[PDB]
Amino acid sequence: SAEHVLTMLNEHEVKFVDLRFTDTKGKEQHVTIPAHQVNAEFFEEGKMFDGSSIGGWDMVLMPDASTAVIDPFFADSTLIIRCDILEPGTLQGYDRDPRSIAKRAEDYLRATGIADTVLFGPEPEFFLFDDIRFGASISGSHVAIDDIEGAWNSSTKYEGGNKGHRPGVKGGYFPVPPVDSAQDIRSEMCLVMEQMGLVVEAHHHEVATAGQNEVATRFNTMTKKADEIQIYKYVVHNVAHRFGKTATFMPKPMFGDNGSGMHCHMSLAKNGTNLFSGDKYAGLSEQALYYIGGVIKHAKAINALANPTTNSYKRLVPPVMLAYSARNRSASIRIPVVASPKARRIEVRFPDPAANPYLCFAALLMAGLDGIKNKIHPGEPMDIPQVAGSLEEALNALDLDREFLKAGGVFTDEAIDAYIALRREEDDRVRMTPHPVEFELYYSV
Amino acid sequence: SAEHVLTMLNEHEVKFVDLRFTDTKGKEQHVTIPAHQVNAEFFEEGKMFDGSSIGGWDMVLMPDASTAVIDPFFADSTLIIRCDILEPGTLQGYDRDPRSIAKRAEDYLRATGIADTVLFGPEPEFFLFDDIRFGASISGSHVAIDDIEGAWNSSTKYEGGNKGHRPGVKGGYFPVPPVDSAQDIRSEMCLVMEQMGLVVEAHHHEVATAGQNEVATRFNTMTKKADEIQIYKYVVHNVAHRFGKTATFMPKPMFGDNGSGMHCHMSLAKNGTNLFSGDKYAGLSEQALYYIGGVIKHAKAINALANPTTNSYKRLVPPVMLAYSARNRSASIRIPVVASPKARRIEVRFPDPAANPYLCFAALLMAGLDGIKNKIHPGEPMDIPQVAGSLEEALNALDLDREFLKAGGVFTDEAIDAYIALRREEDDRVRMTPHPVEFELYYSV
Amino acid sequence: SAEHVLTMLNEHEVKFVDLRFTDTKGKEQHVTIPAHQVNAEFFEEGKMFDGSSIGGWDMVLMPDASTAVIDPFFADSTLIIRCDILEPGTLQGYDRDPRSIAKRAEDYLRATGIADTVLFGPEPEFFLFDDIRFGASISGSHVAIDDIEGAWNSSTKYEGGNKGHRPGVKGGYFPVPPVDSAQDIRSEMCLVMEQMGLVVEAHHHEVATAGQNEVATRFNTMTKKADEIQIYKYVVHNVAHRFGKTATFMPKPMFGDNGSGMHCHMSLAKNGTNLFSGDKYAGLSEQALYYIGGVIKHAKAINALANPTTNSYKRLVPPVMLAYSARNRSASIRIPVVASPKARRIEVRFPDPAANPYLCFAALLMAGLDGIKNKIHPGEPMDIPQVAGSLEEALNALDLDREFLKAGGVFTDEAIDAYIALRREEDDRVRMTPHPVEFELYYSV
Ligand SMILES: N[C@@H](CCC(=O)O)C(=O)O
Ligand SMILES: N[C@@H](CCC(=O)O)C(=O)O
Ligand SMILES: N[C@@H](CCC(=O)O)C(=O)O
Ligand SMILES: [Mn+2]
Ligand SMILES: [Mn+2]
Ligand SMILES: [Mn+2]
Ligand SMILES: [Mn+2]
Ligand SMILES: [Mn+2]
Ligand SMILES: [Mn+2]
């Protein structure tokens, strides 16, 4: 409540308040107010900003006082407050603001009465490098990745000495220190995440050489979890930075080793009960099977939001199979063997950290409801259709399979059109710029 | 009062008093007295200095005891006192001293009875670089800008490692840390500004890559705000310096990305009421519309003072349109959608941080009054005339549209002539020195 | 004649024929045919090329067989043939092709009966440097000039030893070797020019340090002389190159020392007699005085063609005075003291080597005829109006004083409009790119 934020301000000698919001692409934006400008008026009628120079968008920042967290990194005491972008005076909420779209998808779920709450559990992976250099110019282009754990540094002269314990290319999965250099960086990330209100469940090194890592975090309701992904990413980016590292959530930074995916565990609940539990395949309800059928029916349109970068598809090369299974980890829909009670859920394996968590989760939910809503029966478990094979395909697919997103006003046409417009500009730059392996393949033609 | 300054001296064990004043170009000058020379005589009959070697000007420094601030940076305890330049013995105030000219424009407003007070709200932007090298010689010339946030450093080898989070060319507008490197430098700038008597409203990164920033600051009456711009600039220059950065207020340091403008919000008030509020276009009074009409009528003469550098016009290339609007941000006069009560005001978007805040504000006020004073009706909102396209144009225009500035003795002819003389010398050096892209364009002729 | 070219081909074992033409900007273009494609058909119906990618313009190259010269530089025996650009099939001559425009201005002179021939004598100056580096990018810009003769190298360590005889900044005018490093390079330029059909009169070092030079060459009729300037420039550029130097015709490469101008000596003749000789001021006819009056009347429009680069105006800073005189070398129209018979002529001092010699000469002639044609009496000799002070001014002036150029179809409106369009693009790049002395002037604002 406003009341509560106002005590924290004194209770913490807060010098500044950081207004934060997420844009269409997914990047957390922010503007800073002195604490002495937080008073009634503020939580009442928000603060005006020029929304015009935000990519894909005067507007009003409306502070959500439930979100107040103290920033673990800025030097002066700062209280972060997440905001919604509202349409000014009229005060309804930009239909292009991803947090508003997430909130709408949650209310539409309630209005359909299929369940009261959506529970999301994203598993975001990241890379933690020491040096990343890249560039493109008329005379050429390059990218150079470097990290102490890179299997390629086995030959490197280091002046401290080389020391040689390092994860080989698919060998980052699990060896104790010193092969895993990041135990203290991940534990620190866990402690700062909890200080910001997240609940860590586990942290470990991932499969790739050169710093792949994962901090596993307890689930939440869709829009709250989407904000927790924005804090997750902020803590990973800044703790890495304090440690002299650079972290990245891009899906596929290295060819020849693992990519970073963000698998979404989903579940639905009506009056304190898990609608996905039941009889049917592996403890699932018929309700749950239609949710899977809706996700599979709309997978390529979902890919435009859950895999929104041209790089995403370097990862999604032959979890490409649109199929559910408790057995086949090759099927993009895994039914986790919970064994346990009514933690029954589905896991969609194909999205990646580059996805805007609000739009990505809203689209998975809207697809899953359209399955239920039309008895779209999934089929049989593989123990056969595939995800979009490229961003251009995914964008065409979103453009044509636009209907399930527009249900109940969650996502307008202007919103979907402006989104495809942004992603197309990106796709073009990648399409028109010659790639280094083309010189390898075609220079002596 | 003198009395008050004299207590602060003991109350702070002040070792020195720094006498400060602004020259015609806008640069804050200063001379330092030991605290033990501040006594009755001082606040009474000022201190003599050789005014002769100040560009464009024995004279007397008259301490304004209302302005006493402790300097947050000098090692020994120092009390800053702003001064006015007075004509010696006779004690009236140099008609070429920009602070005196500002004070005269405020009294002339009172003498016309159109309002009691002018309220100015400048929005100055700046750049925060790490390295700036430049030079011109017979055999050539160069400038080299560098900053950690420069999109161009994506390819750079750094020996710490490169870390790669950086604002792209028009992408400095708003991303959270680590992409925005300056959160602590701007918050610190905010805290030192307030310690010097300013009220910060907000601080944020601006649109440009390579360190564009903005600290938004609460309005004031014209001459007081013009001094607050001189403190604003002093704090930005010295906090940046403590941080190992170099700040600059020049309008256009980089081609191909945003420039730093200083938009002036203006409003007029008679007996505690906002004369700019009313009926008419977007909450405006007819009074306000004539103010806009005077600004537009005299825009090119105002440009010689509000855009006084040849570099200013590298920014003002196709807010060039002399038009008012609540809608068109392309119109140089924006009527801000206050929505709120009688914070109704106009915003002139075209001036830049290089402007002498006293002369720039005095000229906007004198132009705006001549509009009121002659019912110079602005026209209709673009939702078509332009600003001077060059300093030479702006200087010719000031020279011919000299009358509205001379009203009530605000600005003499000698004052306007000496000003154009200074700005012409500058224009010539830029006009006669061959430019690097000319070799690109014409060497193989 | 075709017949003649065809013998030279055998007479010289010519392996290739180089088709050359000049574009709107003045740069000589070329395409190469094997000698075995020169036959009747060729001199008859020309050769087709894509005129579309020439700046400011399928078309036909029509070989002018009078122009055949052997190329003194290509390794394989090549015969250069100058061409006219004709409108295809219809075969009339592009009204935007500068050589055609020159030929039209000569025929219009004949059709007016004022004289049979125009005689032009351009005095082009050039610079001969060793190293020229420059560039402009978002993070900055630079130009670096270097030559062994640069007064600035007096301090330079050279590893051969420094040897120290060098022209000081305005001291390149006339000292014997070793101070003048270019005696053999200029004599060689003279011998190759004559081998290409030009008649050298004198060669000498010019006023500037760092390699300013001049090869003086015997006059000709307008279009023939305009082609001789294109050969002049080609020989200077390639002999310099063989010598390890780089030559440039740009008007003002160095601030603080002389610029390279191309003064045009002009004269008119009817039935073997010099119309410019007579009684009146300094041996001049009344006919000649009206020619001067037309040049002065149209000077700023002529500047858009005779001084077509933004750099041109770095040279034309306070021969700026539009005045004739036998005495005042400050007057842009000098009446040379011939003393001798009826070599009486006028000299216009203001054009520079960057000018397209066809369009520059055609415009001086058309202006001079409009003087005669309307008795535009010049005035009295200075022993007061000036040339355009910038390319933008010159381009506005050409755009408005368009009439005298359109006389008799010499220059169409499309031709004049496309020309201003090209020169404007150039002016803009120079106007929008920040200049290095602006950082010197305004960084600490
Ligand atoms: N990192 C894998 C996911 C690994 C896993 O299944 O644990 C991906 O690219 O999605
Ligand atoms: N920086 C812009 C102003 C940006 C804005 O309108 O917020 C300028 O050059 O004036
Ligand atoms: N080089 C001079 C001309 C020198 C001369 O008159 O001989 C110019 O800039 O035009
Ligand atoms: Mn994982
Ligand atoms: Mn999983
Ligand atoms: Mn701004
Ligand atoms: Mn503004
Ligand atoms: Mn000469
Ligand atoms: Mn001469």
Q: Largest Cα–Cα distance of chain A, in whole Å?
A: 71
Range of the domain at B401: 98-433
Centre of ligand 2 to C-alpha C324, Å, is 51
In a domain, A444, yes or no: no
Q: Binding residue per annotation — C377?
A: no
A60 and A152 share one domain: no
Q: Which of A96, A186, A205, A263 is catalytic?
A: A263
Q: Which atom of ligand 1 is nearest to the CA of A208?
A: 1
- Among all chains, which residue has been given the structure tokens 């402007």? B355
B14 and B152 share one domain: no
DSSP letter for A46, please.
Answer: -
Centre of ligand 1 to C-alpha A203, Å, is 14
Among the partner residues B27, B426, B432, nearest to C314 by beta-carbon distance: B432
* Cβ contact C311–B255 (<8 Å): no
> Residues enclosing ligand 1, CB less than 6 A?
A 125, 258-261, 315
B204 vs A contacts (CB less than 8 Å): 30-32
- Whole-number Å distance between alpha carbons of B27 and B148: 28
Based on the structure, what is the number of domains in chain B? Answer: 2
Centre of ligand 8 to C-alpha C99, Å, is 26
Q: SS3 for A162? A: coil
Q: Binding residue per annotation — C201?
A: yes
Q: Measure the CA angle with vertex C224, ends C48 and C40; round to 5°.
A: 35
C37 and C142 share one domain: no
Token digits of residue A434: 């010659």
* Cβ contact A54–B188 (<8 Å): no
* Cβ contact B250–C134 (<8 Å): no
Question: What are the residues whose beta carbons fall under 8 Å from the beta carbon of B187, sequence distance 6 or more?
Answer: A15, A16, A32, A74, A75, A76, A78, B203
Among the partner residues B137, B252, B439, nearest to C132 by beta-carbon distance: B439
Question: What are the residues whose beta carbons fall under 8 Å from the beta carbon of B2, sequence distance 6 or more?
Answer: B40, B43, B65
Centre of ligand 5 to C-alpha A123, Å, is 7
Last residue of a domain, one of B54, B71, B97: B97
Token digits of residue C179: 């101070």
In a domain, A443, yes or no: no
CB B176 within 8 A of CB A234: yes
Residues 9-68 on B with a CB inside 8 Å of A are none
CATH number assigned to the domain comprising residue B12: 3.10.20.70
Centre of ligand 2 to C-alpha B237, Å, is 20
CB B216 within 8 A of CB B201: yes
**Residue C243 contacts B, CB cutoff 8 Å:** no
A53 and A130 share one domain: no
C84 and C231 share one domain: no
**Known catalytic residue at A58:** no
From the list B152, B110, B108, the residue with the least C-alpha distance to B130 is B152
Residue nearest to atom 8 of ligand 3 (CA): C261
Give the nearest chain B residue to A88 (CA atoms). Answer: B339
CB C196 within 8 A of CB C283: no
- Among all chains, which residue has been given the structure tokens 């009474």? B44
DSSP assignment of B128-185 equals EESEEEEEEETTEEEEEEE-TT-GGGGG---SS--------TT--SSB-TTSSTTHHH
* Cβ contact C311–B438 (<8 Å): yes
**Known catalytic residue at B329:** yes
CB C214 within 8 A of CB C260: no
Give residues whose Cβ lies within 5 Å of ion ligand 5.
A 263
In a domain, C438, yes or no: no
Chains B and C: how many Cβ contacts under 8 Å? 205
Cα–Cα distances (Å) from A142 to A173, A438, B341, in that order, read 29, 13, 55
* Cβ contact B202–A29 (<8 Å): no
| Structure determined via | X-ray
Last residue of a domain, one of A38, A69, A97: A97
DSSP letter for C328, please.
Answer: -
Last residue of a domain, one of C49, C76, C97: C97
Phi-psi region of B51 (alpha: psi -120 to 50; beta: other; left: phi over 0): alpha
The ligand placed nearest to the CA atom of residue A124 is 4
DSSP assignment of A55-94 equals TT--EEEEE-GGG-EE-SS-SS-EEEEEEEEE-TTTT---
**Known catalytic residue at A12:** no
Centre of ligand 7 to C-alpha A53, Å, is 12
In a domain, B442, yes or no: no
Q: Binding residue per annotation — A414?
A: no
Among the partner residues B158, B161, B339, nearest to A88 by beta-carbon distance: B339
When scoring C143, C230, C237 by the number of chain B Cβ atoms within 10 A, the one with the most, hence best to mutate, is C143
Among the partner residues B154, B163, B176, nearest to A246 by beta-carbon distance: B163
DSSP assignment of C26-90 equals SPEEEEEEEGGG-SHHHHHH-EEE-GGGSTT--EEEEE-GGG-EE-SS-SS-EEEEEEEEE-TTT
- Whole-number Å distance between alpha carbons of B438 and B441: 5
- Whole-number Å distance between alpha carbons of A312 and A249: 11
* Cβ contact C440–B140 (<8 Å): no
State if residue B298 touches ligand 2 by the CB under 6 angstroms criterion.
no
CB atoms within 10 A of CB A261: 22
Residues 169-198 on B with a CB inside 8 Å of C are 169
Token digits of residue C43: 């001199």
Resolution in Å equals 2.8
B209 vs C contacts (CB less than 8 Å): 138
Residue A11: burial class (beta carbons within 10 Å; 0-12, 13-18, 19+): exposed
In a domain, B440, yes or no: no
Question: What are the residues whose beta carbons fall under 8 Å from the beta carbon of B285, sequence distance 6 or more?
Answer: B275, B276, B277, B278, B279, B344
* Cβ contact C139–B150 (<8 Å): yes
State if residue A3 touches ligand 2 by the CB under 6 angstroms criterion.
no
H or E element at residue B238: helix B222-242
* Cβ contact B438–C150 (<8 Å): no
B178 vs A contacts (CB less than 8 Å): 237-238, 241
Question: What are the residues whose beta carbons fall under 8 Å from the beta carbon of C30, sequence distance 6 or more?
Answer: C18, C19, C20, C21
CATH number assigned to the domain comprising residue B243: 3.30.590.10
Q: Which of A82, A96, A104, A349 is catalytic?
A: A349
**Known catalytic residue at B438:** no
When scoring B435, B440, B444 by the number of chain C Cβ atoms within 10 A, the one with the most, hence best to mutate, is B435
CB atoms within 10 A of CB A165: 13
B155 vs A contacts (CB less than 8 Å): 133-135, 142
C87 and C227 share one domain: no
Q: Measure the CA angle with vertex B438, ends C367 and B309; round to 5°.
A: 100
- Among all chains, which residue has been given the structure tokens 């309804």? A92
As beta bridge partners, residue A122 has A264
* Cβ contact B175–A89 (<8 Å): no
In a domain, A439, yes or no: no
Q: Which of C125, C149, C227, C392 is catalytic?
A: C125
C320 and C351 share one domain: yes
State if residue B259 touches ligand 2 by the CB under 6 angstroms criterion.
yes
Range list of H helices, B36-85: 40-45
* Cβ contact B311–C141 (<8 Å): no
- Whole-number Å distance between alpha carbons of C69 and C337: 35
CB atoms within 10 A of CB A441: 10
Give the nearest chain B residue to C248 (CA atoms). Answer: B443
Give the nearest chain A residue to B179 (CA atoms). Answer: A237
DSSP assignment of B261-286 equals -EEEEEEEEETTEETTBSSSGGGB-H
B370 and B300 share one domain: yes
Pairing of strands C47-49, C28-34: unpaired
Over the range B6-45, which residues count as b (16 or more CB within 10 Å of their CB) and which as e?
A: bebbeeeebbbbbbbbbbbbbebeeeebebeebeeebbee
Cα–Cα distances (Å) from B153 to A185, B184, B257, C174, C436, in that order, read 26, 22, 15, 49, 21
B342 and B271 share one domain: yes
B108 and B87 share one domain: no
From the list C232, C230, C228, C236, the residue with the least C-alpha distance to C185 is C236
A50 and A153 share one domain: no
B154 vs A contacts (CB less than 8 Å): 133-135
Q: Which of A327, A329, A431, A435 is catalytic?
A: A329
- Whole-number Å distance between alpha carbons of A231 and A81: 12
Q: Which of C347, C393, C399, C426 is catalytic?
A: C347
Q: Measure the CA angle with vertex B218, ends B212 and B220; round to 5°.
A: 120
C108 and C89 share one domain: no
In a domain, A440, yes or no: no
In a domain, C250, yes or no: yes
From the list A274, A286, A279, the residue with the least C-alpha distance to A344 is A274
CB A341 within 8 A of CB A201: no
